[PDB]
Design a protein around this motif. Sequence first.
Motif, mmCIF file in Angstrom:
data_model
loop_
_atom_site.group_PDB
_atom_site.id
_atom_site.type_symbol
_atom_site.label_atom_id
_atom_site.label_comp_id
_atom_site.label_asym_id
_atom_site.label_seq_id
_atom_site.Cartn_x
_atom_site.Cartn_y
_atom_site.Cartn_z
ATOM 1 N N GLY B 35 34.298 51.160 32.856
ATOM 2 C CA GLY B 35 35.459 50.286 32.934
ATOM 3 C C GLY B 35 35.639 49.633 34.286
ATOM 4 O O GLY B 35 36.750 49.632 34.831
ATOM 5 N N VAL B 36 34.564 49.078 34.847
ATOM 6 C CA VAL B 36 34.590 48.488 36.177
ATOM 7 C C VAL B 36 34.122 47.043 36.087
ATOM 8 O O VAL B 36 33.436 46.640 35.146
ATOM 9 N N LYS B 37 34.511 46.259 37.088
ATOM 10 C CA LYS B 37 34.141 44.852 37.156
ATOM 11 C C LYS B 37 32.741 44.724 37.755
ATOM 12 O O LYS B 37 32.014 45.707 37.920
ATOM 13 N N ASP B 38 32.346 43.495 38.090
ATOM 14 C CA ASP B 38 31.020 43.248 38.641
ATOM 15 C C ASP B 38 30.874 43.724 40.080
ATOM 16 O O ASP B 38 29.741 43.829 40.566
ATOM 17 N N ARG B 39 31.983 44.010 40.769
ATOM 18 C CA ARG B 39 31.899 44.452 42.158
ATOM 19 C C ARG B 39 31.109 45.748 42.274
ATOM 20 O O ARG B 39 30.205 45.861 43.107
ATOM 21 N N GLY B 40 31.425 46.735 41.435
ATOM 22 C CA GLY B 40 30.670 47.979 41.459
ATOM 23 C C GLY B 40 29.228 47.791 41.029
ATOM 24 O O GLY B 40 28.320 48.446 41.553
ATOM 25 N N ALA B 41 28.998 46.896 40.067
ATOM 26 C CA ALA B 41 27.639 46.619 39.617
ATOM 27 C C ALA B 41 26.781 46.104 40.764
ATOM 28 O O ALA B 41 25.650 46.560 40.964
ATOM 29 N N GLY B 42 27.306 45.151 41.533
ATOM 30 C CA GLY B 42 26.588 44.699 42.714
ATOM 31 C C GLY B 42 26.503 45.768 43.788
ATOM 32 O O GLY B 42 25.498 45.870 44.500
ATOM 33 N N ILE B 363 27.061 38.275 44.718
ATOM 34 C CA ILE B 363 27.101 37.621 43.412
ATOM 35 C C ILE B 363 28.226 38.201 42.565
ATOM 36 O O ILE B 363 28.987 37.468 41.920
ATOM 37 N N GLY B 364 28.351 39.530 42.560
ATOM 38 C CA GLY B 364 29.417 40.156 41.796
ATOM 39 C C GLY B 364 30.798 39.767 42.289
ATOM 40 O O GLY B 364 31.707 39.525 41.492
ATOM 41 N N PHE B 365 30.973 39.701 43.610
ATOM 42 C CA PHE B 365 32.261 39.322 44.177
ATOM 43 C C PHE B 365 32.613 37.883 43.830
ATOM 44 O O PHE B 365 33.763 37.588 43.485
ATOM 45 N N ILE B 366 31.639 36.973 43.913
ATOM 46 C CA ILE B 366 31.894 35.583 43.546
ATOM 47 C C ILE B 366 32.257 35.480 42.070
ATOM 48 O O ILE B 366 33.198 34.766 41.692
ATOM 49 N N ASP B 368 33.598 37.799 40.147
ATOM 50 C CA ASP B 368 34.929 38.360 39.935
ATOM 51 C C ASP B 368 36.016 37.420 40.439
ATOM 52 O O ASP B 368 37.058 37.265 39.793
ATOM 53 N N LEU B 369 35.799 36.789 41.596
ATOM 54 C CA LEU B 369 36.791 35.856 42.119
ATOM 55 C C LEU B 369 36.974 34.668 41.186
ATOM 56 O O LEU B 369 38.102 34.214 40.961
ATOM 57 N N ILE B 370 35.876 34.147 40.636
ATOM 58 C CA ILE B 370 35.987 33.041 39.691
ATOM 59 C C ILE B 370 36.680 33.495 38.411
ATOM 60 O O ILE B 370 37.526 32.781 37.859
ATOM 61 N N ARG B 371 36.344 34.693 37.925
ATOM 62 C CA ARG B 371 36.893 35.168 36.660
ATOM 63 C C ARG B 371 38.379 35.489 36.763
ATOM 64 O O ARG B 371 39.114 35.318 35.784
ATOM 65 N N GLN B 372 38.839 35.958 37.925
ATOM 66 C CA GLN B 372 40.252 36.298 38.075
ATOM 67 C C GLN B 372 41.138 35.063 37.965
ATOM 68 O O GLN B 372 42.271 35.147 37.477
ATOM 69 N N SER B 373 40.642 33.909 38.412
ATOM 70 C CA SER B 373 41.424 32.681 38.371
ATOM 71 C C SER B 373 41.611 32.136 36.961
ATOM 72 O O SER B 373 42.417 31.217 36.776
ATOM 73 N N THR B 374 40.898 32.668 35.971
ATOM 74 C CA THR B 374 40.959 32.165 34.608
ATOM 75 C C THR B 374 41.202 33.318 33.644
ATOM 76 O O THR B 374 40.935 34.480 33.961
ATOM 77 N N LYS B 375 41.730 32.986 32.467
ATOM 78 C CA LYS B 375 41.927 33.987 31.426
ATOM 79 C C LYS B 375 40.591 34.595 31.021
ATOM 80 O O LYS B 375 39.602 33.881 30.829
ATOM 81 N N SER B 384 31.566 32.016 34.663
ATOM 82 C CA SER B 384 31.755 32.528 36.016
ATOM 83 C C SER B 384 30.470 33.134 36.561
ATOM 84 O O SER B 384 30.102 32.891 37.716
ATOM 85 N N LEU B 385 29.770 33.926 35.747
ATOM 86 C CA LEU B 385 28.510 34.499 36.209
ATOM 87 C C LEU B 385 27.455 33.422 36.421
ATOM 88 O O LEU B 385 26.651 33.520 37.356
ATOM 89 N N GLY B 386 27.442 32.389 35.576
ATOM 90 C CA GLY B 386 26.532 31.279 35.805
ATOM 91 C C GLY B 386 26.810 30.561 37.111
ATOM 92 O O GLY B 386 25.889 30.238 37.863
ATOM 93 N N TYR B 387 28.088 30.315 37.406
ATOM 94 C CA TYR B 387 28.443 29.689 38.675
ATOM 95 C C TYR B 387 28.064 30.581 39.850
ATOM 96 O O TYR B 387 27.613 30.091 40.892
ATOM 97 N N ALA B 388 28.246 31.896 39.704
ATOM 98 C CA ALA B 388 27.877 32.817 40.774
ATOM 99 C C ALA B 388 26.375 32.801 41.026
ATOM 100 O O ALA B 388 25.932 32.774 42.179
ATOM 101 N N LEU B 389 25.574 32.814 39.958
ATOM 102 C CA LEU B 389 24.126 32.771 40.122
ATOM 103 C C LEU B 389 23.627 31.385 40.505
ATOM 104 O O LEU B 389 22.469 31.249 40.915
ATOM 105 N N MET B 390 24.472 30.359 40.386
ATOM 106 C CA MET B 390 24.104 29.031 40.863
ATOM 107 C C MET B 390 23.933 28.997 42.377
ATOM 108 O O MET B 390 23.407 28.016 42.912
ATOM 109 N N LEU B 391 24.380 30.039 43.080
ATOM 110 C CA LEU B 391 24.157 30.128 44.517
ATOM 111 C C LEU B 391 22.703 30.436 44.859
ATOM 112 O O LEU B 391 22.281 30.184 45.992
#
Lengths: 126, 423
Positions: B35-42, B363-366, B368-375, B384-391
């Motif tokens: 039950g964790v976000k992408d931050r722990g995954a990264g 990547i996980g932090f980016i 999560d930050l993108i995902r928090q701003s949207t439902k 959001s993950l696509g935008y994060a990996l676009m870096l």
Amino acid sequence: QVQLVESGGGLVQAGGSLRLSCAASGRLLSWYDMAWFRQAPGKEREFVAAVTSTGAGTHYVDSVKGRFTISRVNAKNTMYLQMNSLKPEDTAVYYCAAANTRLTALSLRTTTGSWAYWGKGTPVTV
Amino acid sequence: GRGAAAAILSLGNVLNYLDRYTVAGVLLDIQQHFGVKDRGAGLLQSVFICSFMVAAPIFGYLGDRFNRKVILSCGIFFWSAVTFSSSFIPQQYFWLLVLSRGLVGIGEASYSTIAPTIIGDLFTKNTRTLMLSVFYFAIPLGSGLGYITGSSVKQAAGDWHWALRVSPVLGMITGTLILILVPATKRGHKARTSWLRDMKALIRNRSYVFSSLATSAVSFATGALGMWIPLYLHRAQVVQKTAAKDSLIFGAITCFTGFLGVVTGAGATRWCRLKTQRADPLVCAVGMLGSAIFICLIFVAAKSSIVGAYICIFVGETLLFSNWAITADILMYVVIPTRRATAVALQSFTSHLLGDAGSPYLIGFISDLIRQSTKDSPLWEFLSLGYALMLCPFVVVLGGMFFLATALFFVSDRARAEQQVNQ
């Protein structure tokens, strides 16, 4: 596969100046450290001078420093050697040799066997 | 027959990379379970790489203190036991798995720093080069085996926990064999002052710094992709109306692309050195630019078809891995032999520091930050993950520019090295 051709060597009067040109056409010359050797009639092959890949490193012999100059041009793919104030003991056949470039001491590489590539060789008489 | 030691060490390295990349295939299962976000995954991969980079020089120095076989076997047993224990971690605890990944990284760093020296000491011939080539070809095969093993165990067992349980047992079977079929070699050889002098000489160097930054960018991209691509593909498939397969496909692609990229980089270098003396950095730069183009292309065409995504991943990973067999040749052509080894260590630090370590957590932090701003929704989290990996293509293009700068300074630094050696 690199082919080395020597030119400009021949019999000259004592005390003059001479230029020897070694040309390569098999591959690019920037990948090879070059050197000159001489085969004395009464001795075996002897080291003369050597030039690294970029020309920033030069080593000579105790009887060669201050008498010979050696350099290379990679744009024209040819190395040159200038001999000045030739001694009578310089009459021998000179061979241009090339070896795969290595970041070793050029002075310590004077074994006349480490150079896997050789040339036709030209005779110079003083 | 001394080849038994080389074979068992190669199998141990295959198992090492399998254990390293097992978590990559079941990252989705771990995220769902804890039950964790992408931050722990990264953070898992970030901690693993940080521990690896911190421990590798320490074990390299310790290898000259006592026998290397004993410490190698001890490290293998340590990381196997740590993984086995982590397989039984309660759900409510998450930092314990991070500490376990750190311990596994310590053990893997010990093995990766110790074993190649033993292999090099065993063989002194062209056979040494062949055995090292096999031991290093074990890397992409090991990563692919790890991905496919994680996927297959997760599918067959029905629970991701056994994914962390199958690998350690074999490690024990490996370790005992290493304790038995590895001969002991009776070999031997100012340290801080030498390190300071070498660092001072290397900082003034120009092409070395740019090459180190380029390989750091390469490590960044490789870590981010190898950590997030299977999850991204699973999210994309969820987005599509059509209802473990992705991990197996990505593992096979990773192995094939690693081998093909090494082969094609070697071939391009062999057939391009005739044109000019700066072939080594130019080939790397061209490969990086192509890989960046294809990494942008996959994200462009991910929403349309998954076959196109697989093809773009194949091409991009091949081009990205093409530089692995050329970075070493770039390094050995500039740094003088006396300072070569230290240089490698510094690179083996820097590439891990600015690169592989920060990439997964960033990547996980980016994301999560993108995902928090949207439902929260599968479509929005996939975007959001696509935008994060676009870096990643940005970093790949930066690495290409660094390789171009290395090509610019290549001949000048080579001349400086020659005149310093002859001095």
